[PDB]
Amino acid sequence: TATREVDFTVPDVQKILDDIKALAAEQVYKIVKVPSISFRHIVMQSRDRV
Amino acid sequence: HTTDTKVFDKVAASIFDTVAKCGHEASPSKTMMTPYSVEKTQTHAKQG
Amino acid sequence: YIAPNPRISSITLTQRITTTGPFAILTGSTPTAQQLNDVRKIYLALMFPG
Amino acid sequence: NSKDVFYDKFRTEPNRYKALFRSSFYNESRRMNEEKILEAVKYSQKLG
């Protein structure tokens, strides 16, 4: 009778602390040599306008 | 302090390599690394 | 029917120390058939006032 | 290592380490144990 229902009345603080410690090492920015392309060009049968 | 797989694997590998470097050999077949079971001096305990 | 959250009556400061509710003996009880029927009667009386 | 132990109740709780057992170390331990059983049984079958 005692072990019929799964229990959640006690939390796991060590798991929370480990998760926060792991999250502290997340990287947001990047280091690049060349910035990404912002404008591109479509060409047609013309030789003066795009 | 982890639940990731490869970190645990590399930790176990480091332990075994250290034992080998100490001029000994530890059998991985019977080496124990477990959460919920304890054995000591021919005494066995499982889940309390 | 929904039971209340078990954390309301007790909080665990540590893995070893927990607070104790005054009615802990009653909370461990489990209703029989007759008592459950009486609970249904009580709610039926609540839903129809007079 | 303290010996002042008392026992209260049986409980059930979720297993935090359930995902760790898919690691290489446990697979290798299981493999070595089962293959050891295989050499035992084949030696017994060869002798008699």
Reported structure resolution in angstroms: 3.1
Contact of C21 with C10, CB cutoff 8 Å: yes
Where do we find the tokens 């390599």? B17
Determine, for residues D23 and B5 on separate chains, whether the beta-carbon distance falls below 8 Å: yes
Residues 6+ apart with CB under 8 A from B39: B32, B45
Q: Which two tokens stand for residue C7?
A: 């954390």
Q: How far apart are the first and last CA of chain A?
A: 79
Contact call for residues B16 and D29 (beta carbons, < 8 A): no
Distance from CA of D36 to the nearest CA of B (A): 10
| Residues ≥6 apart with Cβ < 8 Å to A5 | D12
Residues ≥6 apart with Cβ < 8 Å to A18? B1, B2
- Measured between its terminal Cα atoms, the distance across chain C in Å is 23
Q: Which residues contact D31 (CB under 8 A, 6 or more apart)?
A: none
The experimental method behind these coordinates is cryo-EM
The whole-angstrom separation of Cα B28 and Cα B17 is 12
Q: Which residue of C has its CA nearest to A10?
A: C12
Instruction: List chains touching A (3+ CB pairs under 8 A).
Output: B, C, D
With the CA atoms of B12, B16, B21 and B24 taken in that order, what torsion angle do they form, in degrees rounded to the nearest 10?
160
At B44, list the tokens. 């066995």
DSSP B7-24: HHHHHHHHHHHHHHHTT-
Provide DSSP, A16-40.
HHHHHHHHTT-------SSPPP---
> In the numeric block, which tokens belong to residue C44?
């039926």
In this structure, chain C runs to a length of: 50
Q: How many CA atoms lie within 13 A of A42 on its CB side?
A: 0
